[PDB]
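Schema walkthrough. Field components (list of strings):
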Amino acid sequence: KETSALTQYMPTSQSLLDEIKEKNGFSWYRNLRRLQWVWQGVDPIEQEQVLARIASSKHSRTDEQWLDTVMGYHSGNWAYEWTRLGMEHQKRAGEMTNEAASEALFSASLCYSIAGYPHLKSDNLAIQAQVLANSAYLEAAKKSKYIIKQLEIPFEKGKITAHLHLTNTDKPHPVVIVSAGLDSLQTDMWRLFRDHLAKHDIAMLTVDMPSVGYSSKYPLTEDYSRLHQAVLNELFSIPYVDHHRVGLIGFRFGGNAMVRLSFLEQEKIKACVILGAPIHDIFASPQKLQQMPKMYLDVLASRLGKSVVDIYSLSGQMAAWSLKVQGFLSSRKTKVPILAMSLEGDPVSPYSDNQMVAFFSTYGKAKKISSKTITQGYEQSLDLAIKWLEDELLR
Amino acid sequence: AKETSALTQYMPTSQSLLDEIKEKNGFSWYRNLRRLQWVWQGVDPIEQEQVLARIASSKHSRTDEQWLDTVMGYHSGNWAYEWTRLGMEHQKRAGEMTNEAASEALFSASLCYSIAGYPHLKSDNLAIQAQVLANSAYLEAAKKSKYIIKQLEIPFEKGKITAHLHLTNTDKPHPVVIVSAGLDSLQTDMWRLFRDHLAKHDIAMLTVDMPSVGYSSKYPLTEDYSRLHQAVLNELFSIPYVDHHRVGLIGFRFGGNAMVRLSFLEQEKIKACVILGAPIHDIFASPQKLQQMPKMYLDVLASRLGKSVVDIYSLSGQMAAWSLKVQGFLSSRKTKVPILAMSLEGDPVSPYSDNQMVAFFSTYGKAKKISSKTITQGYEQSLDLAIKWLEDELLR
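Field assembly_structure (string):
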């Protein structure tokens, strides 16, 4: 029961899947995000090594065309190789100083998360890896000189778990609420804080979208930005944060959620940055959704709790996740300035989607993270985005 | 993230009592290591020593420096931390091994993750997450095993009961043994029992957590605490892999209390029952003895009974309801089920008088006292006696 075969599809969808696979010609089931995972903290060379071991394995795969589908839990297996790297980081933290061990443990946590990626609900190995990601992160916080508090907010018969990151507790700090993509965990953004936000005593408060990680028991529903509203409403009682200086950062669908929030809570938000967020295109165009890779569809099916999946039907009901169809991107612009960006060629977040967001935001801007230029590309774009958000917050 | 030994809340005079007896005993451990030796039969001695030395050697702050296993927080020296480290090593080695060896390394990993959470207190978050690691590793081990392990889900009281059916094969219906570990152990803690004992005669093992424990944590531990095992017994007719006409029961500690009770309630579908270290009457009928039990023992009782603040005086009084004698099972007529009741010499939880009582009220029943104090001899002897008793009835 290897990851890529866990999700079941209807006969006609199996045919569609086979065609998309043939058209793509990709050598991987999973969508590889090597650049982003490096930005998040994975060493390029260790990544190369892990992926090469996955790629070179002679063990049987679910689909030989997909290098990352070695079926048994042993060398070659995706979860296994990534878990081995995480363990290597975690072991080394043994006789290190607290700071160096803290960072070694944060790296361990990311490796475990990637090991479980895309985090399908039914994936036994991913479920276990998520635990490992969490324990590593909490061990890392134990050793860190920064303050990391795990907050619990009661909501709809359950509790929302968020992590607040502070440089100190000597005054309210402007705060940035962050939410990663549906296939990421809230503990995957330590670098965002340590290399950027921390530089100015700007706190980071991470939150899992409904159906993800700590929020896995909250269904998505049409009101998928609700856990964030809940969290926003609790800020006033957290003395270490300045609820008057709240910024937002959303990745992928988390970004879609941050835009919604930017309209719903217009008067309480200072600024917002979204990266690679699906805003309208993919959701309002059935055929486009019908051309997405199986991994992306397995995630959507898993988060929505679809047992046997019918892509045709699914592609039809997603239009509701379009912020244009919802009616946010049509009439009045939001007072919240929004910086919307994504890498060139991203089918999930086309340039047009981000142009839309900027148009309906007072002072909004849509930048395209370019390639071909390394020193003023990915890393620089991220940097500027970051800088701009601060300015809105610190100013 | 409170440290395990500090999670249970006691009323001032109860804490006072706890402090007097802890001071009187002068024990160096919160957790009962002697008790843990049942499960430790699955982990290598050299590894036990190494994990325990790291825990005891730690310079990190403890809730109580008298109890070596109470290092606070998730870092070196912490109990869950150290055992989880060993579990991870085994898990890593498994991926480099092949066949049965790989299977066994994952079973070792699973058992280590389980030990990490011991005694599995409800509000213990590290233990809860360790339980997830235990369950995931157990499932990966089953996938690698040549033996068959089926996770069953039985609908009950607007819920589901999760049980694991272990089989040597599914070529024909097999005699089966329903098992219940204590209130401080998980149903997945018994791979050894099946692999090294039941398996030789193709006897299947069906594990089930008692109410308030593991997979059955959401089921309150009422007075009818044998109901989940009773519901599982009824599903047997529908499981073609088992011979519902050849069913046995093995109960460990409080689990044993539950199997005796079931042995009286279902005298026709149960062909034999064995219990080890089961608290049948003495302790629950003596509040004075209970009041002197170690804190970990009481913490477990309080957690399973779902108490918010604990009053040892009232709690000791509440337990009388658990005596099988007080319940009326051990008083009138004998049960037709053959019950073997045993415990080790000097168990303050399961005295010989307790087991003699059970044997008396059992037709062809027998009580036995394992005069040993060493685990090596006490385990093999008691278990060897158990399997023999079961085989005679079940392989007939």
